[model samples]
Target: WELSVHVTDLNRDVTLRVTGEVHIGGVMLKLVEKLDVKKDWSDHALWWEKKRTWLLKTHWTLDKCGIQADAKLQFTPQHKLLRLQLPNMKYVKVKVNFSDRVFKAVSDICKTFNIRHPEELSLLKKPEDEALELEPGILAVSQPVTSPEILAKMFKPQALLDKAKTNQGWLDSSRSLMEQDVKENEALLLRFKYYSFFDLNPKYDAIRINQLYEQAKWALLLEEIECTEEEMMMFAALQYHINKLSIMTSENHLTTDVNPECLVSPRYLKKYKSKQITARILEAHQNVAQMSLIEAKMRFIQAWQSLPEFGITHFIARFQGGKREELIGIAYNRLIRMDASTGDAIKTWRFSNMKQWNVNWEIKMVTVEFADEVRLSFICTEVDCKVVHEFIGGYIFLSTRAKDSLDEEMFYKLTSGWTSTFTNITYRG
Candidate 1:
């Protein structure tokens, strides 16, 4: 089988044929000899399919690797450092050489980051989009540095990075960027913080040898954390105000609509306003009445309930007369009764039925001469009755507006007639 091998770093290509039973090691050697390069065969290369990779092992034959004739094969150099930008760090010129181990190259990278615990550290390519993650110590030359293209190799979910903010968590914390840090207590929860850092220098070569080596440093680099209790409180308060102001400004900037009334339908919005206004009016009415009116009402109810159990609980005096002749009106709870030939018996008039109770029953618009003639005949049964007229302290005039006009001197006299006087009486009146 014949194939073309493209060296990624040198940007060089060579075509070769596998005359049966030849291994990949032999092909590497022939390619190196043809180019007259000092590179060794032990240096590994990988065949790439877009973002995925496959090892081109030295012992594998063309048949084992499924190599075909006239096929274009993309290749990558393994165990190469991507890029490392550190602040306040001194550096030296370096080159990618042939003789080096995998562990040696990675450890050299750890040294650049000044990482003591390589186990706790991760290899990341800080791209222009700011998505950094561990890159399997493998790459094609000019492969994207921590770009969205390498998202498949990432360990965490994408949502977590999207939720992150400046100095919000350990990932973006200022302490993570610092050389050392102090412990944070729960009391500092409300405090605000900031994270600020910059890429050191641009323009590094293919070997990632920190080419613009000299210029480097960090500002504020706030390291020391010891403080008095008073200082700590001041810091907390300041940060609290700062964060509050920032949030206020941010929401203001995001104020898409000035009036939110348009968000709801006009019918429902009108109903909501109407309900609010009705509640306010009812509240004001009750406030004006207060406890005085309520207490008096309770007392009136108690007195009504305490009345004697008389069969004729009430009587409606229906009169037919003109105002010019001799007007007569029976007033009770704002009801003015007039002429009615058929009388109604007030049935089931319980003292508890305040809805039907007459708290204010009075007599009005009656002739002054007939006031004394008027009488309330409350008959329980035949011949067993009480004719309460303007007599017996004039009880009929007790709740009347015309009480002052009552002639007590002309109270009803018991006529000495010997006949059993009677008139038709209803019981529930």
Candidate 2:
């Protein structure tokens, strides 16, 4: 019986006729014959299935080879000194193949010898015979012969490690400071140049990048280094503080009693029998002020355009002059500024004191910026104003309409009264 083999490394497929009991060595011989390649009998081995990981026993029979009817093998070179290219013109010689992921391999190299960071290491391969290019991913080689205890001298990265050691102290200090901030609930604003000491390779500022810093920061930093959740959290907490800290607070407010004269009397519109939606446009006015009243009203209307979908109706407006201000209302929630006003929205802050002026009106004074401080406050209703009090004030209005009941008698008198009659009279012109 003949077994099939796909030699991916040599880019060919071949087969071997077995003589009762044949081993991987026999398979390799058939591959050498088909591919016209030479291998050292003592060192070269058949790596079947997974790349770079050699088959353990070369003398194993075909039945124990563990490969199915179809199989693949990658022929890897076993050299005296494996040249690993790190960054720059740095190269390290390894007598053994501890082929791991490029990063993991370097980490072990650092870990076994107490190097702080793995950025100090990289893997390089020569494409043709000149300078080396970076080779990505894990190196799958399994076996190695070198013993660190018996090595003559490993001059690779000794100086770099020492230099890095000095810089690592600063990183350690930062880590401590960040941990303290997390403990104290403080925030630190930091920008990364190289994200040194952090294993993260970020495209943007990680802390400011988003809201889920608790997990996102962990993922970003974990990519470049092995770190605990606490470490990632500490860094994220610092940045989160920087994001929310108030920057400016000075002379930004004006508080005074609103002028009663400036505010026009609120008109009571028709009391809708059904539920009515209402909004309280908070204090607003224009007299001797920063923004124009007309411009303020225009901006106010534009801003409230988002409220119709919410069933917002009437709102309250306040007019303040000198040190005191007065209150007023409008059918729709807006401040037309009785004298002269209007423009774009700036900013507004609501005070803690929330008050209800009427059964349908709830008013709160909020300090505002950029002119139109008069915010339209509208609360939605279900059917009408009387029904508005039903769900709102805990009961319905006892005051009834002309015919409030939906009994058939009322609608039948109007709709059912229509009779279908057919009379043979001339088509009346």
Candidate 3:
């Protein structure tokens, strides 16, 4: 399969690609009631914290589709995680084990521990085996389903526990959430774009467009040829089809220092006693692959720019789009410098060192004029400023907060306390 049609192509040469985008997005929903992180000592020892979480598992890719003996169609998702929350909660998280997951539900819930439950089926367990398919035994469910008759027989015992949990309410419970970060929302954007990609016609468009390039690149809007909507549909459809199976390589991040100063895992707030029950409903197992999009995008851009000979053009456009040169020119040398300091547009690199040598990178930009075919020099008349960026970093970037996490702290704490009495409280964060 060519790049266009074979977006899902996994053939003789498996291109172990790690390509994807992840974006972080969240809005503190309007608190129906006042919320506080700090509170005065209360007579009731147990308290509840209710918050609404909204998340989208929008980056849906179908990978590793194969037929078993029954001819039941199946696919092993490349996603390794999922984190989505439900009505009036914080968020939902999802992760798919690109390979097989330990087909078991591992939760803190007493009844669910070593006990397969419906909720666990969606998490930890990959939809492997036979239960998940629209047909029986096509996709695996984490736990075996028990007979309704058996459930009825034990109704009294289950009801008592269920009632107690309901009385406790979600607000007073400690939330079990997957990791979260405060950063620009990039995954959300790609989710929106993925929706746009499907607008192409689904029928014959596949055949016409798959023959283009065997890779996915930014779609250009250069002066159009005689290609019509039918032609355009064919192209868009073909490109997306290939994008589906086209798993790109990912960055193997350098290990964190013994004690990173910027990064953090502030989960200590949820743990009080080893035996205490938390109100959180974690979907990390299901949200694994979903959460990885942001990093995937970062990987894509990092490689995209780092590819050889991409700097000159990208630098100019990025600067122009960011108004970096414009801002710097406004306040020339006396005070002015590179583009907008307060704006997210213009940026400069700050590498510790740069020994002149070949760095890996690639590019796709509007063709620029060159004196010779061998060594080209592009001239773009659209830009108005002349300011340039010069930095010591191997890659110049529009300084960001992503790297700030490198300094976060993770320490353990132990404490003892006792309390009784409680009432229902509803609030949000």
Candidate 4:
């Protein structure tokens, strides 16, 4: 259950060796980009080529071995540049921090000098090696590339020319199509999003014990949300994004690799045996709760009630203000309210094969002439929010980057993170 990473930076010749143990359940990683070199980025075709490579290539050196969640890892450093002895904990637990000064330096250098500093993710191995030189930028100092940043960098004269040649039509129609395609990919990334899911097996309604706290876990930290005239409107829009991710693949309740056999859906049951599970998922809609425990044990095959309809798969919240909300009370609404008699249920409906409500929940930003005010505005595109909450956003963070040849187009391996949602069960459908 433990992991350690050691990193060394050689002006860019970053070396990394990760040591970790592997278990039956898998894991996800968010890699940081390395460095980037852009010469003729003005061209749309070349730009797309570079952007795709920039987002995909993060060095993941996992030392794989068969084990369980209770397994172990031991790593030794060969040559220590900057060492981080830590596990693959959540963002809250990992504590991979960087000073504002460090972050600004990394961001400005990459923007002003066309350089890259990649952050990577992986597991730890036993018998740690002392010589592994992980890249120095694992501190995650670089600011994530934002939409404004991409547009700002794409404003060069050559970029415009390239856009005109490939994207422009004498009419706005042609340009619109091209613009949509490019933005589609970028929009898929759900940045700074907090999400939650419910077991919509219908039996969710009549819980023996109050399962509401489980539903309440999806709120954005009170501090992440921004409230003001304009900011409040923005927060509402972010809520819309949170609602969307629950719609896609809606009908079927999301199942984990719970048991080899723990299946309500046949697609998974073919691979995993239903017998491997301890608790079984009964397909009695809301009727199972009224029956005896033994009757509830009878496994009814999942029947197609009109080809599995789409329903809410998950929920998300946008900005809960960071320290400010934690320290101060809100001016308007109480985010957490458990004791409402006329309470609305979490899954009023289901998507046959849909994951309810796709959303692009994220930290909404504001234009700050000075420090970000306590009442800072939260702004987001209603369009983009929908893309994110659905867990399909191409939520890419640019880290280390280096550019070389356009023909060969040497876009060296960089660190980047996939914009997927997380789970306590630690497996996905």
Candidate 5:
């Protein structure tokens, strides 16, 4: 009873004939010898693709493992060392098996990092570099204008939504690393996904809070979260204070021109190109210099958390009939539609008042129904229809999970409506 099986590795695939009584370990050794691979036999394993399972037990024979003729299998390393990027730009390595669930991996990571509350932390896959690029028109919105009267008029609400593609790197806790297509040596971010200021303590959760602050700062710098001119100046001042603190703490360091323009963006400086703006920032910086490093970071986080767009994920979209594009924001409990040009909220629909939402993939349109029999349809300009649906559904899912009283009705509504229409739509982070 010989079985003909196709085995694949990172490089090549080969068809091999083996007896049904042969152990998987024997097959692994034979492949190593035949392919002249460098890795040891113990380091390699066989994966059954169709069954979506790994063959790691060497005692299991080909027959016992259900290997059949013409079966396809993957030959790869038994474990991978993945680097998790912390919010403070530090990386920690964790060894994980392909079969390890995200929840298990995160728990192990939390133990290693001594994290008290593992549930609040999430592992986010790094979005592709190309997805971070901003469009020229979007960047132009940060350009400067002249005249005090014109400056007030020029403060029109610019769309906060980045023109880049939405990040699809959110990892589901229930799924395995291999199931999520995670590869070896890949870097994932360990971030504070769920926002709850009351749960965080400055003394006990210093590291976690610092991580959150770094994430918030990066979000503002990347323009993922929107901030006003005044808020931006405050951020710049805080950043300048922190930088100045570092210089003061060290001896034999000369004072350099810590320009506020350098703290934010040149484009931002060009936008508010005025002596008063820089002077204000410097004055703010000096006023905060008396505070400790931790206090400054905490203040920055506090300021960021107070923003209207703090926890919202924004997307560029247009109403079904409207010719102009608008911004659609998905928060924990509600949906907001804003004028893209002016950034004014046109409407907000809470999940409690919302009856249901639907996404039409063929037409790339999303429709949301309210309790009053009101329906609003939107066509997303930046992301796919499924993405819009995912954010809406994901946030609602998170909201339901946060409460102790499970909304069985909403759960059934989501599961029944469009849950199964697409795969990988679960947003765990």
Candidate 6:
């Protein structure tokens, strides 16, 4: 039995005929001979397009890899290093191939970190503050609102917030890193993209939860997210509780005396410019001395997750042909227009009500239309319009797919031919 194979290195395609019973290694020899490449066979990999998987097991027969009939394959380098930024703000290096998909990199990251639930995580592009590029011109609008009431709402614990069903800025898991323009040693963020508290078991989920807690803590402290004075007190108390509990649980012989003064940092006191707030935080910390470490962490996370802007990607944008700037926030299900000065939501447009969206790359503007025939147009001041378009499109793609299984064929079918110029299009309902 014979098979006809079409192989490409993304630059060119070559047609070759081989026996089905031949080992993949043998096929690689032929591929190199045909392409006239002097590199070793081990340097390259065979990517089976039909299976949407890499054929790295060269010892296996072609037929064993389901390459029996006419096969379309990608021939490419076998490995590259990717710099991954964790939720805890630490960086790690991961090995992946140019042909490896985003999902493959995600699984590699989970394995490297010993995370049990790979499905709950997604790798995202390192968030760049696009608005910062405008500098003094739009500095006022780009500044984060730091009022205490707003901060409290941003940090308050709401036990009833719905679990996230989708994530923004997710690279298409089915497409290869090369196809997605991911450069070698590119830095990406590993985040808890989807939210399901039910899946969190203290035994296996400790690392995941701890990383998430660190991310939330930093987001608040860095002013990436808002929090109220009361909420800050609660957070400080939780931190103190966790520290005190760890001391109680540990075998260290040092004094287990946890001080409220030690819990309040001088820098924080200076930031709020209020010794009164520190006193309140100290009082709150003393009140939570009885809480366990696990419970304290969980409570802290609950408060972090409750914020409406918890998982949002914010951009500074202006209405078309207007000078005044507003904030546009993109989440999994909707786009929110917010008052840049107050951080208050002005309007929200859900994906369900979205009729279509267009990105004019030439002008770097995005126009979105709704089912109600209301059209909204904005020019992103901080980033290219395509970034906004990709977030919306990627979320829509994720929401439409089955949560249980992310099929690569489905991804290819939806995004294949139109990847180059598919703009100003309606999402499939």
Highest lDDT scorer: 5
Per-residue lDDT tens digits for candidate 6, residues 120-176, read 566776422111111221211111234656555545332111111112345666566
Question: Where's the lowest-lDDT run of ten residues in candidate 2?
Answer: 392-401
- Displacement of residue 100 (Cα, Å) in model 2 is 7.3
3 versus 6: better TM-score goes to? 6
The model with the greatest TM-score is: 5
Comparing 3 with 4 on lDDT, the higher-scoring candidate is 4
Candidate 1's residue-wise lDDT over 174-259, tens digit each? Answer: 11111112111111111111111112111222112111111100111121122345644543443344334323322422244434
Writing each residue's lDDT as its tens digit, candidate 5 over 1-429 gives 433344434567665668878888888776766777565556566777678777768888988988877777788776777777766545656677666666567767766665545555667776421112212222111112234474344233333643323334556655567766677777787876556443566556655556677777766765667889999999978877766664444333224666556677567666787665665666665434434655777888989989987776667787866778777877766788887667688888776767666677666778777766788888864234545564565555555453234343453344333313422223232
Residue 372 shift from truth in candidate 1, angstroms: 95
Candidate 3 global TM-score: 0.16
lDDT of 4 by residue, 1-429 (tens): 332212112122322223443221122121122223332312111012221211111132233332223322211111112222222111211111111122232233223222222111111111122222333332211122245464354233322122222111111111111223322111111011112211223333222111111112111112111124454344334334323322321323435454434235667566555443322343332223333321221111111111121111111222334322111101111111111122233122111112212112454222111112112222234332322222221111111122321111111111111222321111113
- lDDT for each of the candidates? 0.30, 0.30, 0.21, 0.22, 0.62, 0.61
Error of 3 at 298 (Å): 3.3
RMSD of each: 45.3, 34.6, 30.7, 25.2, 13.2, 14.4
Candidate 2: misplaced stretches above 4 Å?
38-54, 66-429
For candidate 3, write residues 209-234 as lDDT tens digits.
22111112232112112235654565
Candidate 5: pairs in clash: 144-271
Better of 3 and 6 by lDDT: 6
| Segments of candidate 4 deviating more than 4 angstroms | 1-8, 12-429
Clashing pairs in 1: none
